[PDB]
C-alpha cells in the first residue's frame, strides 16, 4: 500500500505498521502535518522511522505516507548564496513564505525556487540525435557573475538527445532536455535529485597534488592542505572558516553547521553576506560563491546527521562541475553525538564512551568523499572537495573516540593546543603534534615553483623541536649549560614562533598571508639562523669567539627588520614590493654578518 | 477549540517508579497530557512519553505514590502540555508544574503555548551584540556577556554561585555613554535556603513587580523539574518575542534538572549514555539552552544565565560537557578561590565567553577593553604556571619576571577579582583596575597589546 499507519512513538523515533513493501532508508511523511522521516528498521509489515522534526502530537493510527526515494537533495541553479535546513529546506524561503521567525513543523518549501528565472545557454556541441552520458554538461546557467553553474546530465542516466532548449530564460520546472534509451523517453529540467548517502560516482579519484592556502603561515608552511585535502581541526574555527571563505583558491565554498550554537550560527549567517573579496579586478561578496547548511543544536538528532550528508553531496555536485570546492563542518563531534543519540534510541549496543562501533565507518563515509576527481562525462575536467571537519574533544583530549576515528582517516590534522590558546598565541596550532601526510605529493609543486621552501620547511621544524629540548632544560639549569649555537637556536625559534607561526586573524596585516610573503619571511629567519650559526662555529677553538651576544648586538637592526616582516600589507604592498624588501633584508643580513667574518 | 469530550481510563496495567502504563487506549498522542484522579480523591498531572498501539506510558509530574492499578482514573486531554501564559506572570511565584504558589489565582491566559517552543529560523535570528554590565569585573572584563547570550555559571558543589546570580540580577544593565530586564527565575531541585535567598532578594531589591519565579525545591517530586525550565523559557518567549520585553532567564541548577532526565530514563529501561544519563541529553539540553537571542522585527530579547553544579567538580562530566558544547562558553566558580575567601570565586582561566570577540569593540565599549582582557588573561595563566613552580622548584629559583607574574596573580585576585556582593563596578571602572594591574610589568612584557594602545594607556 501507498501509506501505512503509526503504530508507536518514542521521541524522534516512530514505529509504523502496514508498511509491507517499504525499503530501508526510504523516506516517509508521518502524522497529518506530514513530518519528514526515514525508515531505519523493517520487521514484517512494521517499520521504524527516524523523524527529522519534533514528534510531539503524533498519534497512533496517524497516516504514514511513504515516498519511493531515499533522503535526497535538489541540485541545480539557486544553491549559490542559499542557506538550508539539514534535510535541504531553504531557510531564506521558509522565512519569505511563512512571514514569521519560526520554522513551521512539516513545512514543504521546494529546495530550489520554481519561480526565479535563469539564463540557460545550451552547450553548442549538442544536436538532436547526439549521444550523452552521466556528467555531460548540456548547458551553462549564469547563476552568478562568479560561478557558472554547469548543468549536468544526472549519473545513472544516459541516452540519445531528442529535445534541447534554445538559449533563453527558463524555470526549474521547464524540461530543458529530453533524452531516450531502450525506447524509454526521459524528461529533465535544470534540477536533478540525488541521494545524500550515495557517493556521486567519478571517472578517476586522482592524487591530490596542489596546495590549498589557508592563509595561516603556520599551516601553509608546516602542515599544508591540498586541493581535495581530507583535513581536521580541534574546534576552538571562525578565523579558519572566514579566511578560507575570503581567500581559499576554491571557487565554491560550503559551510555545515551540524549542531551549531544558535548565536554562532547567526554570526556566520549575518557576517558572510557582508564579507567580500577582490577577484577578477572587482570586489564581490563571498556569498555569491558559497552555500550554508545550518542546524542549530536544538534541531532534532536526525537533522544533525542529514546536515553532513547534504553538505558533502552539495560539495560533490560543484566538484562534478570542475570546481575545487572547499567545505567546512562545525563539529564532527556533534555529528558523532547525533549518531550516539540515534544508536541509543534504536536499542543498539554502543562500544566505547556510549558511541556506536560503526562510528568509524560513518566518519569514513564522510571524509573519504573528499579528494581531486576526474569528473564523469564528456568535457574532461578536474574538480575537488576539500573537507575541513572540526573535532572539539570534551577537555581538548585527542584520545577521545571521535578524534581517534578521525585521526585514522584524515591526511591533515591541525592540533590546536589549550596552552597556546590560553596565552593568546594565535592561530594556536601546536607545531609538534600537527601533521600533513600530503607533503610527499606537494613537494612536486614546491620543487617546481618554490625550490628554497623544502629546505626551509625542514630547518623550521628542526629549530622548533630543538626549542622544546632547550626550553625544557632551562627550567632546571637556567642558561648556564647552553652553547652559543643553542642561544642562536632559541633566538631564531622565538622569531619563528612569535613573528612567523604567530598571526593575528582579525587585523588586516595578518587576516590572510600569501605564499610569496610566507616563504620570504621564513627564508629570511632561517638564513639568519644559518649565518649566525656559521658566525659562532667558525670561531670554535679560535683566539676570540663570536658569541651569541656579540651577534645579537651587531645584528640588532636586522633582528628588528626580521620581526617587522609580518607588517607588510598584501593589498597595498604587492608581492613584487614584498619580495624586493625581503631581498634588501637578505642583503642587509649578509652584510651585517660580514662585519664579524 | 478541542470541544470534543475527554476520555478517562482505569486501564492502568502497571506503575514502574515515575511511570504509569495504560492499555486499551484509543489513539494516544506522544507528549499528550493526562490527569490522574487517585483513590484518595486527589488530582495528579502527567505526560505520555511512549505510545504503542493501545499502550501509553505516562510520566507523572506530581509523583506516583498512592496510584492504584484498578481504582486510578486517568483522563486524557487529546493535546500536548500547552501552558497558559500572560504578562501577569511577572510579579508572581509558581511551583515547578506551572501552578501558582503565592496567594494569587490561576494564570489568566493571553495565549496557550507549547512548552517545547518552536525552532526559530536561523535566517531570522539577530546576532547578540550589546554588552551587559553585570557589575562583576570577572564577567564584564576577562569574559563578557551580551544581551541575547546564553552563558552559564558553572560551579563546584557548595560554592556561592547563587550569590553571583543574585548579584547579576541586582546589578545587570547596559553600558552607559525602560533599560530593565524582566528576570525569569527557574529553580529546579533547590534547597529551601536557596529558594528563600532568591525570593527574598527579588523582594528586598524592590524589583519583584518585574520578575517571574518558578520554584521547584529539593522536597518537591523529581519529575516536575523537567517542566520547570521549559515553563520559564516559554514565559521568556512570550514576554520577549510577543510583548517586546528584554528578558533574563536564570536556571538554578541544570545538574538537578539532568538528574530528573536520568530518573525517568532509567525507569523507561532506555540505553544509557555515559555516566547513566540519557544519550539524548545533548538534544534535550539544546531545547532548553537554544531559547535565547534577538529575532527579526522584535525589539525584545532573551538572555540566559543557566547555573550548573559539577558532580565531584568534574569538568568532563556529561552535564557540564554537553552544556559547554551548546552554551556560549561558561563562567566557572572555583574551590581554589573560594577556600581563599575570594568573592566572587570566578576563575578567569577556565571561564570563556564566545561573544567576547564581538561584544567588545570601539564605540560598543572602551576600545582598549579587548586587548586589556587578552593581556590580563594571559598574565594570569603565566601567573598560575609560575605559582606551581614556586612550590615545585622552590620560590628562590624564580626569575625577576616570574616573580612579577606571581606578584601580578597575588594583586589580581585581590584587586581585580574580589568585588564584594554590593559593589557594582562599571566596565570602564573595571578597565582602570585592569591597567593598574598591567602596570606591574615593564611595557615590553605586554605582548598581546598593540604599541599604539600601550602608548595611549600604559603610562597612566
Amino acid at each position: 500500500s501507498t501509506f501505512g499507519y503509526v503504530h508507536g512513538v518514542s521521541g524522534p523515533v516512530v514505529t509504523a505498521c502496514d508498511m509491507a513493501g517499504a525499503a530501508m532508508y526510504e523516506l516517509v511523511r508521518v502524522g497529518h502535518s506530514e513530518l519528514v522521516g526515514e525508515i531505519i528498521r523493517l520487521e514484517g509489515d512494521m517499520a521504524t522511522i527516524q523523524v527529522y522534526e519534533e514528534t510531539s502530537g503524533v498519534s497512533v493510527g496517524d497516516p504514514v505516507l511513504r515516498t519511493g526515494k531515499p533522503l535526497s537533495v535538489e541540485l541545480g541553479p539557486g544553491i549559490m548564496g542559499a542557506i538550508f535546513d539539514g534535510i535541504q529546506r531553504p531557510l531564506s524561503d521558509i522565512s519569505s513564505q511563512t512571514q514569521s521567525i519560526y520554522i513551521p513543523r512539516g513545512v514543504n518549501v521546494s529546495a530550489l525556487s520554481r519561480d526565479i528565472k535563469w539564463e540557460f545557454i545550451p552547450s553548442k556541441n549538442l544536436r538532436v540525435g547526439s549521444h550523452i552520458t552521466g556528467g555531460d554538461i548540456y548547458g551553462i546557467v549564469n547563476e552568478n557573475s562568479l560561478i557558472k553553474h554547469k548543468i549536468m546530465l544526472p549519473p545513472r542516466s544516459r541516452g540519445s538527445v531528442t529535445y534541447i532548449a534554445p538559449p533563453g530564460n527558463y524555470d526549474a520546472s521547464d524540461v530543458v532536455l529530453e533524452l531516450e534509451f531502450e525506447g524509454v523517453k526521459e524528461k529533465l529540467s535544470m534540477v536533478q535529485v540525488w541521494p545524500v548517502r550515495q557517493v556521486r560516482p567519478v571517472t578517476e579519484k586522482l592524487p591530490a597534488n596542489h596546495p590549498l592556502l589557508t592563509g595561516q603561515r603556520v599551516l601553509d608552511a608546516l602542515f599544508p592542505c591540498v586541493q581535495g585535502g581530507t583535513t581536521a581541526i580541534p574546534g576552538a574555527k571562525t578565523v579558519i572558516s572566514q579566511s578560507l571563505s575570503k581567500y581559499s583558491n576554491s571557487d565554491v565554498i560550503i559551510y555545515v553547521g551540524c549542531g551549531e550554537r544558535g548565536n554562532e550560527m547567526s554570526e556566520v549567517l549575518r557576517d558572510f553576506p557582508e564579507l567580500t573579496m577582490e577577484v577578477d579586478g572587482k570586489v564581490e561578496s563571498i556569498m555569491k560563491r558559497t552555500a550554508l547548511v545550518a542546524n542549530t543544536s536544538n534541531m532534532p538528532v536526525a537533522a544533525r546527521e542529514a546536515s553532513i550528508y547534504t553538505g558533502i553531496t552539495l560539495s560533490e555536485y560543484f566538484r562534478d562541475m570542475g570546481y575545487h570546492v572547499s567545505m567546512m563542518a562545525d563539529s564532527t563531534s556533534r555529528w558523532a553525538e547525533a549518531l550516539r543519540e540515534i544508536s541509543g534510541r534504536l536499542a543498539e549496543m554502543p562500544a566505547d564512551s556510549g558511541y556506536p562501533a560503526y562510528l568509524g565507518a560513518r566518519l569514513a563515509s564522510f571524509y573519504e568523499r573528499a579528494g581531486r576527481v576526474k569528473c564523469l562525462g564528456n568535457p574532461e575536467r578536474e574538480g575537488s572537495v576539500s573537507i575541513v571537519g572540526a573535532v572539539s574533544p570534551p577537555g581538548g583530549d585527542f584520545s577521545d573516540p571521535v578524534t581517534s576515528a578521525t585521526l585514522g582517516i584524515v591526511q591533515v590534522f591541525w592540533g590546536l593546543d589549550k596552552k597556546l590558546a590560553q596565552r593568546k598565541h594565535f592561530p594556536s596550532v601546536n607545531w609538534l603534534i600537527s601533521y600533513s601526510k600530503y607533503m610527499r605529493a606537494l613537494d612536486e609543486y614546491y620543487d617546481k615553483h618554490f625550490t628554497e621552501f623544502v629546505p626551509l620547511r625542514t630547518k623550521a621544524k628542526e629549530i622548533l623541536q630543538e626549542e622544546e629540548d632547550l626550553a625544557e632544560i632551562v627550567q632546571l639549569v637556567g642558561k648556564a649549560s647552553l652553547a652559543e649555537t643553542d642561544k642562536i637556536t632559541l633566538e631564531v625559534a622565538k622569531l619563528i614562533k612569535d613573528d612567523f607561526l604567530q598571526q593575528n586573524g582579525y587585523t588586516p596585516y595578518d587576516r590572510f598571508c600569501p605564499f610569496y610573503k610566507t616563504v620570504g619571511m621564513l627564508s629570511n629567519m632561517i638564513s639568519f639562523y644559518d649565518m649566525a650559526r656559521r658566525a659562532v662555529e667558525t670561531t670554535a677553538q679560535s683566539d676570540n669567539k663570536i658569541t651569541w651576544s656579540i651577534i645579537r648586538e651587531h645584528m640588532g637592526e636586522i633582528l628588528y627588520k626580521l620581526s617587522s616582516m609580518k607588517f607588510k600589507d598584501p593589498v597595498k604592498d604587492g608581492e613584487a614590493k614584498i619580495k624586493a624588501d625581503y631581498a634588501q633584508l637578505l642583503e642587509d643580513m649578509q652584510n651585517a654578518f660580514r662585519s664579524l667574518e | 477549540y478541542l470541544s470534543q469530550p475527554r476520555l478517562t481510563y482505569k486501564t492502568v496495567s502497571g506503575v514502574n517508579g515515575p511511570l504509569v502504563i495504560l492499555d486499551h487506549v484509543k489513539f494516544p498522542r506522544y507528549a499528550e497530557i493526562v490527569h490522574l484522579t487517585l483513590p484518595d480523591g486527589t488530582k495528579r498531572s502527567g505526560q505520555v512519553l511512549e505510545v504503542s498501539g493501545s499502550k501509553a506510558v505516562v510520566q507523572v509530574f506530581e509523583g506516583t505514590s498512592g496510584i492504584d492499578a484498578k481504582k486510578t482514573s486517568c483522563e486524557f486531554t487529546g493535546d500536548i502540555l500547552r501552558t497558559p501564559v500572560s504578562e501577569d506572570m511577572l510579579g508572581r511565584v509558581f511551583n515547578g508544574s506551572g501552578k501558582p504558589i503565592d496567594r494569587g489565582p490561576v494564570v489568566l491566559a493571553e495565549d496557550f503555548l507549547d512548552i517545547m517552543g518552536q525552532p526559530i529560523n536561523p535566517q531570522c535570528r539577530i546576532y547578540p551584540e550589546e554588552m551587559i554590565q553585570t557589575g562583576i569585573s570577572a564577567i564584564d572584563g576577562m569574559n563578557s556577556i551580551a544581551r541575547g547570550q546564553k552563558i552559564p555559571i558553572f560551579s563546584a558543589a557548595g560554592l556561592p554561585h547563587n550569590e553571583i546570580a543574585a548579584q547579576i540580577c541586582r546589578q545587570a544593565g547596559l553600558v552607559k555613554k525602560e533599560e530593565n530586564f524582566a528576570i525569569v527565575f527557574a529553580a529546579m531541585g533547590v534547597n529551601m535556603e536557596t529558594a528563600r535567598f532568591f525570593k527574598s532578594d527579588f523582594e528586598e531589591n524592590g524589583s519583584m513587580d518585574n520578575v517571574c519565579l518558578f520554584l521547584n525545591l529539593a522536597n518537591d517530586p523529581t519529575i516536575e523539574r523537567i517542566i520547570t525550565p521549559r515553563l520559564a523559557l516559554t514565559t521568556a518567549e512570550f514576554l520577549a518575542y510577543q510583548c517586546e520585553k528584554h528578558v533574563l532567564v536564570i536556571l538554578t541548577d541544570m545538574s538537578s534538572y539532568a538528574e530528573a532526565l536520568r530518573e525517568v530514563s532509567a525507569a523507561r529501561e532506555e540505553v544509557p549514555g555515559r555516566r547513566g544519563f540519557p544519550g539524548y541529553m545533548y538534544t534535550d539540553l539544546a531545547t532548553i539552552y537554544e531559547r535565547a537571542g534577538r529575532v527579526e522585527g522584535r525589539n525584545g530579547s532573551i538572555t540566559q544565565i543557566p547555573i550548573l553544579t559539577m558532580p565531584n567538580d568534574d569538568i568532563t562530566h556529561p552535564i557540564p560537557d554537553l552544556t559547554g558544547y551548546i552554551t556560549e562558553g561558561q563562567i566557572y566558580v572555583d574551590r581554589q578561590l573560594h577556600n581563599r575567601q575570594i568573592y566572587p570565586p570566578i576563575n578567569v582561566l577556565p571561564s570563556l565567553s564566545r561573544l567576547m570577540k564581538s561584544a567588545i569593540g570601539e564605540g560598543m565599549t572602551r576600545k582598549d577593553h579587548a586587548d586589556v582582557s587578552n593581556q590580563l588573561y594571559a598574565c594570569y595563566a603565566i601567573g598560575k604556571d609560575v605559582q606551581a613552580m614556586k612550590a615545585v622548584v622552590g620560590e628562590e629559583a624564580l626569575t625577576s619576571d616570574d616573580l612579577l607574574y606571581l606578584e601580578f596573580l597575588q594583586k589580581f585576585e585581590k584587586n581585580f577579582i574580589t568585588q564584594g556582593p554590593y559593589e557594582n563596578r562599571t566596565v570602564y571602572e573595571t578597565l582602570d583596575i585592569g591597567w593598574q594591574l598591567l602596570r606591574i610589568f615593564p611595557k615590553e612584557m605586554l605582548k598581546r597589546i598593540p604599541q599604539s594602545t600601550l602608548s595611549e594607556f600604559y603610562p597612566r
Binding site: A347, M349, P350 | E269, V271, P272, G276
Partner: peptide
Amino acid sequence: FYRLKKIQEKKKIIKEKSEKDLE
C-alpha cells in the same frame, strides 16, 4: 558492562514476548 548486559537482557525478553504473542 553491567548496564549493557541488562539492556541486552531486556531486548532478549522483548524478542521472546513478541514471538510468544504471535502463537
